[PDB]
């Protein structure tokens, strides 16, 4: 009934009134480790110690070495399934590696580009599976690269749709991906999805897969995902230069104090370093030795990620319990229960996402902007909301999610009622 | 006139004897010696359990593009720049210069008519010579045309500079090392700075790339007073003209230090808007390391005096060896820098490329002839850069003495022809 809707809306008004009265100051936008997680690697603050030399004898305190410490690259070679000469180590930002590679592609073109992308006078286009990473889209938006949203399925993106786009459009030069524990879909690419993406024919000869494996070992269970050899499949398929692989220890060690990694064919490595050499003499070797001494080996990082999991998994479980209690009866919402990564993706009643965050903002609860997971912040259904549960304490988290549920219910009946 | 031929023979035997000694030395590495890096070995155990900066910031976590205020304050004093006008980045000041050029080409400066890549009249930079090869590699790779400018004693030819910038709108910038130049060793005078920030430009978005890389890198016990290039520019109505750069790569660890960028509040906001598309923020833990290590600006000055104790004898050694073997024949000239990391040696014209070839054939690595010029084009084929910071004093004297043997042989060789 329209009248029983009006009755429920009133109950939601009192709950919002009561929630507003609690005058809170919570935040669900911070995709950063908690202080408890960062304590796990406090040994780094005293590393490397007096021994400033890596196992090869190189003085990490002095200029030199573009590829990075081989000992550290060997640890993540195993974790990612990439050969050491196909993997380099940079500074504190993997996003900076992605941005530089896009900027190099526009200014100088890829290793096999017909011309720099800026010289294509009609334009450049990237494919962006949604919901996706906002900072992925900020790179292409700032660089004038147009972005084409792609639906996300269970085992990866819509490969049928991608294969038709890249076949007809030479302007499509790349695609943003998070192939493991997607931000924020939580979706991990299947072996078949990987196989077809590196095999599909592209109108652009220099099409690139931006393989941001940012959560490669960031499990929320006791199981670690088997990495698909995207570089090996691409080489066997005749497209060795297609994948650009990225990873980072920002959510393994310190967020912003870790090490970044880039992986690709030997030509792509040489191509990137030729232009990165005009920018920097080389990366920070001392921090790379800090992580080498701290980790020890690849089995060490795996154990380190299980201590992160012990801190993180109860928080993801709490968000699922609160949303299930407040919202399952309403049948207005759906949300992921991810096996890894740092984000839960919540879908509320269409046309209420922007309203839900506005209502939450004015009771002291900061929520990720509606549409952040989409290029140009354009969620066509006005329903998606990203939830970042890693940082706040369990009690702060319990109240933020419970408050967010109250606003989502109020915004729901408000939309059904007045329209 | 054949007394030349008599001397050439003596030079041939000295080269023959030099070659027979089968050396393997290097005067190319512009790096601190291991002894210099040892002064900063306390950094290898810093910051310690207290991961928080004086403001309470957890440096281990995401956030903050400006950098730690405590460290920015230390170098605010050392450079003569207000703290809000200065930011701290990662381990490379060269990467700040590259990004700012790339931002200027793709997006244009804070007050540019259009991105530089959209200029059909091309983009041009003025490059005082002898200069920094990595400065020129940026503009060379970016397709920016480079204009060599002669260096005088108090700075570059400002009269020539003011003529070019006044008539050519395509001239958008200029590469400078304002104190202890790489490799001229020249420090810009107050008058030269005042004119460069006051000269009027055909390009409304002209930029002084003020790479103050050797700002506190003295080879005496006195420190150079920094010119307030930003204040003079602001009072002259060109607040956005200077981009200031500095580094701790020659202060602490080469490649493990902190970089700095300075400018007007608009240029800081302009840079950070596009640097935010590139990175969530710089390494705050390493900036906390240097803050704990330095303590204050007076600590950095003391640290630079420890570097001077190691560096000054090496520059004095190179001067003594070149004066001994070369001054009598009057073919060569070289700088005696009061600071910086490089000595600039000029031999006879048409001799540099031959001198480095002769030196490479005796196991002595000399920096490529012309490397201090855009496109490596030394029109007189005479300049040779000497980097005396890294090798041992014995290794240094042998390489420099061997260098003089080759320069004299290539001199006599050319005189005949
Ligand atoms: C998918 C993805 N890529 C990149 C990043 C940024 O990582 P980094 O610290 O290496 O720049 C994030 C962090 O949230 C992310 O979720
Ligand atoms: C050595 C030097 C630098 C050092 O820059 P980093 O990227 O921090 O290593 C910068 N400018 C000049 C002119 C130099 O000689």
Numbering used by the authors:
A (entry chain A): 7 to 425
B (entry chain C): 8 to 424
What do the authors say?
To elucidate the structural basis of substrate recognition by Rv3722c, we have solved structures of the enzyme co-crystalized with Glu or Kyn at a resolution of 2.6 Å and 2.23 Å, respectively. Glu is engaged by both polar and nonpolar interactions.
Here, we demonstrate that Rv3722c is the primary aspartate aminotransferase (AspAT) in Mtb, non-redundantly catalyzes the specific biosynthesis of Asp in vitro, and is essential for axenic growth and survival of Mtb in macrophages and in mice. The overall fold of Rv3722c is similar to that of other members of the recently described type Ic subgroup of PLP-binding proteins. Each monomer consists of a core domain (Pro52-Gly302) that folds into a nearly perfect α/β motif comprised a central eight-stranded (predominantly antiparallel) β-sheet surrounded by eight α-helices. Rv3722c also contains an N-terminal auxiliary domain (Ser2-Leu53 and Asp303-Ser430) that stacks and forms an elongated segment on top of the core domain, and consists of five α-helices and an antiparallel β-sheet.
